[model samples]
Target: EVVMENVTAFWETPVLKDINFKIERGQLLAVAGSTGAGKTSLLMMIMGELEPSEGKIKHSGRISFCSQFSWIMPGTIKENIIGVSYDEYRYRSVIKACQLEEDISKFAEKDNIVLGEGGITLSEGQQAKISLARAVYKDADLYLLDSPFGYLDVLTEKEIFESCVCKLMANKTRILVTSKMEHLKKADKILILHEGSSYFYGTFSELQNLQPDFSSKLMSFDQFSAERRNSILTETLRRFSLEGDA
Candidate 1:
């Protein structure tokens, strides 16, 4: 879905420098960077919101983008999500996958509850999920999510990641901007941005050996547990192939 080669973007100063990465169709690429590290700028470049001063950035197919700050207009929750598509079955699946079913059920008017009116206000987390649901509901080839789970608790993030990103959108190219290490482990590739440059890019295992020791503590750590989980999935996929042959 995306290819970048020696990409450099300037805005008063160089925000990103010589960035290079290739994300194939149906693959997930996680991007991590500290504040002011140009993570969003990189996504914007892919989005064509900004142009690169140097190098090449190429993408094919339609793109669905959920920005860092979730966008929720004043409308019914249903309206916010389905947009113009309005497929009942697909809409329900998106709500469920986004874990918004429970939230919607609690509303007095259910999915019909209008946002930004009558003193009804959704939490930041809820708004984030709705933004995500909207993205998933739209049929798109490349999904660019900037901290889609930023407001959700860790467990909720994991659940939505499994159901929404990992399963429901499994066959679509995704570029997720997040700091969750465990989730990054499952990414087919990861791009760690530092000072507007590609600090590292590779699989989780490859990163494990060469992971940078950051001074900033924005990132979470549970290395042993993540390793265990990785092994479980690896072995499970291995067994699946063997069983199919058997």
Candidate 2:
């Protein structure tokens, strides 16, 4: 499990303020919001890449961080993933889960083909997959992913999520910085960061209930007084629309 207590990060001034959340073991927490919403800062602070001006972060086990950008050295994809630790069982699992097998077949020496500087030999999506493969291959206790899924095509992303992420990291805790709204239901919890603070923190359903968007509030026609339901929905939608436009 990981805990962030009143964490605040700053640059010239405060960029992220008083952030708080908990990531339970094996639970997938999705962090989502508009661009420049301090999503990256939250992950950076958890990884200790940056120190929080306030509060503390605690974790129960090891951490594997996948930055928003993928960085690969000049080497085979296998070398990139296997690096210092090479476990055949784990290695093969990650390869298949990350969907690198077909990709390897095209490589000059399969998994041993020497990649060029900056992974010039591979495309952006492939590089992202290899990067993720490296982290999963390392088998850390906690995974801190910074919007890693955004790099892949829609189809590949789904495969990697179901096979690699969910299956490979099923036992470890994960905090994923994602913009894909679909993950709202797939994840155990959703943390919405707005400006520099937490806008919403809880299960997906709870957020919908609390935010109570018109579509969501209208979900349960019987939750409130039958006569007032329409009025409540109308007002909530109006308020949200105005807020959005503001």
Candidate 3:
């Protein structure tokens, strides 16, 4: 669906360093980065809003996007879902696929229910489902979803991502932007970015290989520093009158 070749986005200085990646049709690519790691800038380039200071971004087909902050209009739930492009069959299917079936029954007007013009005050999880339905409601060949599964619980994330995002959009390629490290288990390909650079990119197995005893490393910190160790050693030796014997 897209290719980023040595792409770098900069202002006064670089926001993202040289990055290279490619997404094939029907593939789910997961992107991981900490705050200010340039994930947003990377997505902007893909969305055709920003130009790379260096290199180029090439993409084919259409793109449907859902960001961290979802947008809902002053209308019925049905209108919000189908605002972009609506297919009745897909509309019905996506509503169920996104787990809105349960939420719908609680609605006063169901899909036709009117919503407040602003600040509907829904839980984060509910917002995620609506945005998800919007993206799936369209038939774009490629999807750029920014942390769409973030608000849901772990089990819910796996469920919604697998059943709704993954299965519903099975034929199209997707780039899922998220900070969750554990998502590697399900993503087809993973891109790990660090401090505006590409730290790693590969399969779950490869990522686990780099885990490197982090838990054990944190546990074995009961030792002293060099100066303290030397000081302690000297004091112990003098106390036993062995300072000169050695």
Candidate 4:
């Protein structure tokens, strides 16, 4: 079991406050909120990377973390996934699960092809999936993922969630922090953090009941074109002066 008591955090100003929650074995908890809602801060605090201004976290087992930033070493995908192992079977299984089989096939050496420094050769979503595969290989008792699907497209995001996250959550306690409310449907429970405090925590169905309009709005988006997606992304970046990156 993992317990958080009155957790609070601040960043120059303030982020989270008076947050409390409990996660048990085999529970999949999704943290959902809009941008700048302190979702990343909450995950960082739980992972011990950032100290909380006040509160405590107690865990019964080891925790494996996947940060929002995708990291891949300078080596082959196989080495990145299962270092020092030449087993073909294990490599194939993980590759298929991450839906990287086709992507790998593009490389002459497949998994043996180097990913380049800092995974510069791979796309953002590819790097994220590789990182996820690494965590899946670790098989930790508790998995802490900080928006693993951030840079992925809708299709790729769904694939990674289904193959990597959803499959892993079947038997492990997973705590994920993400802004993608659509993915919350697969969560065993959902936690909404606002202004650095936990505002809501319950099952996905329960959340729908509490905020019908919000939930309905999320469910209505069945398809999104690249142009439409880019427009939304542009506006979001403009709102935050993030246009330089776009």
Candidate 5:
């Protein structure tokens, strides 16, 4: 079990306050909030990377994490997954889990193909899946992921969400931070945070019924205008520190 009691955190100023929740074994909990709503902060606190300003957190068993970015070493794909173990069967299983078996088989050396330094040659989605596979290989009791589907295409995102997240959570506790509302359908419990505080916590159906206007607002986007698209792109870049690149 994982328990959070009145947890609060801050940067230069307070961001989260009086946050509380609990997760039983094999539950999938999702935190939904707009950008900069302190979803990342909550995850950090749970991972013990940051101490809560006010309150307690209790948990058991090992914790594994998967984030949006990939940090691959200078070695073969198999080495990245198996580390020093070199278990052929386990390596193949992870590859299949991430849907990378077909791609891996295409390589001349298969699992032995070296990923260049920093994994710069791999695509964003590929790197994300590989990172997920690495976490799956860890076989922990709890998994914490922060926006793992950020870079994946729609089809690939659905595939991974079903296989890597939905299926994996069957026997383990999962706490995921995501902005995509479409994923709420699979969540055992959904918590909506606004300005660092949970505004709502309940099942997917409850959230859907409460926010009837959500779907309409999401579909009412005008992507044809260059100015509108640029505005959206600029805001995204500014939020993620990609502004200087543009």
Candidate 6:
């Protein structure tokens, strides 16, 4: 679990101010914002890479952070993931869950393909997958993911979210920075950042009610195709009606 109470952070000047949110253990928090809205900074603060200027930042257990920029070392893909803490069963599980099985099989020398500055080249999506796999393999209680799906295609993103983030890590606390509004539907809570402050933090329905132009803004961001927009509206209406009944 993690809680930010009136937290403020500074980078020369304040980059985040009086931020407040609480995510229960095993809950998922989805962060949304425009470019330079301080979304990544929030994750950095939580990871203890940045010090808060004010208020409290509280959390428990180990953390596994998958940054937007994937980090690769001078070794084989398998070595990069397991990192000398290899357990056959867990390694296999993480590989499959992270959707790396097919990618690994296609590698020049399979998982043994060397990777580094002068080594084998990997696609952005593949590198992201390996980074994600490393984080999951750590089995941390808290996961901080920064647009980890950006490099992935739609189908792969959906598959990874379902298998790795949703199912495989179901009981773990997760904070995801995502540009895709559709992903908000699966989040337990949504945090919308504007500039350096939190514009809104609440459930999706609450956001829709408060931000009347939410749907239009989503479209403005090019977050939906015409067909997807219609499907989202229909599904949202269905959920709203279901909630009304109970």
Candidate that would win on TM-score: 6
lDDT of 2: 0.75
Q: Which residue pairs collide, candidate 3? A: none
Candidate 4 lDDT tens digits, 58-162: 755677888878888888888888866456665666678777888788888877787775443888778888887776666468888887775678888787778
Q: Indicate the TM-score of model 2.
A: 0.83
- lDDT on C-alpha atoms for all candidate structures: 0.80, 0.75, 0.72, 0.72, 0.71, 0.82
Q: Point out the higher-scoring one by TM-score: 3 or 5.
A: 5
TM-score ranking, high to low: 6, 1, 2, 5, 3, 4
Among all candidates shown, the one with the greatest lDDT: 6
TM-score of structure candidate 4:
0.80
Error of 6 at 133 (Å): 0.9
Ranking by lDDT: 6, 1, 2, 4, 3, 5
List the candidates' TM-scores in order: 0.84, 0.83, 0.81, 0.80, 0.82, 0.85
Instruction: Tell me the tens digit of each residue's lDDT in model 2 across 60-156.
Output: 5678888878988777778888887788988998889998899998866788888875443688888888888888787688888886764577678
TM-score winner, 2 or 4: 2
Please write out the lDDT profile of model 3 over residues 1-246, one tens digit for every residue. Answer: 688899888754688888988878798898865556677777777887777888988886788888877667777778888985667888988888888888888877678777665534677788778888888787787888887875676666767877876787777788887644445457889886655787767786776577444212212121443234334423332333335643
Q: How far is candidate 5 from the true structure (C-alpha RMSD, Å)?
A: 6.2
User: What is the C-alpha lDDT profile of model 6 across 73-106, one tens digit per residue?
Assistant: 9999999998888899989988998899999898
Q: Where is model 4 more than 4 Å wrong at Cα?
A: 11-13, 84-91, 117-120, 216-219, 222-246
Return the clash pairs for model 1, or none: none
Two-way lDDT contest, 2 vs 4, winner: 2
lDDT of 1 by residue, 110-222 (tens): 99998875637889899999999998888888998888886787788899999999999999899998767777789899887766887679987786666433312223353
